[PDB]
Amino acid sequence: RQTNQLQYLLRVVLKTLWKHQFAWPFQQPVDAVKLNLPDYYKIIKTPMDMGTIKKRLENNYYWNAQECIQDFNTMFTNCYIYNKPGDDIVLMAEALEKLFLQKINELP
């Protein structure tokens, strides 16, 4: 719901997630080629990462907060859909999502 919440998502939510030790694989799109993952983009049709979210927040792409929250949803959900439970990347996405939930509770 406009600018204040979107700035809170940039300055508080994204910043806290970005600075976490577990952030680095989510800071840029999944490079399925470098990672030797032939079926990533056969399974994942809507890729999403925090680098893209950061750019969208910085260039006023979003109409409202919820559209940004959907991008965070897509990023966490893609990871859960593609990978097995117990995979390290899933545990990292789960810990980032826990931190995301702690921050979006104080959403103005």
Measured between alpha carbons, how far is 86 from 92 in angstroms, rounded to an integer? Answer: 10
CB of 13 to ligand YX4, least distance (A): 10
27 near ligand YX4 (CB under 6 A): no
Site string for ligand YX4, 43-82 (x = CB under 6 A): -----------------------x--x--xx--x--x--x
Complex with ligand YX4: residue 60 or 84, whichever CB lies closer: 84
Contacting residues for 88 by C-beta, under 8 A, at least 6 apart:
none
Q: Which stretch binds ligand YX4 (CB under 6 A): 2-10, 11-19, 54-62, 100-108?
A: 100-108
Amino acid letter for position 12? V
What is the length of the chain?
108
User: How many Cβ atoms from other residues are within 10 Å of residue 6's Cβ?
Assistant: 22
User: Rg of the chain's alpha carbons, rounded to an integer?
Assistant: 14
Interface with ligand YX4 by CB under 6 A: which residues? 25-26, 30, 35, 66, 69, 72-73, 76, 79, 82-83, 88-89, 97, 100-101, 104
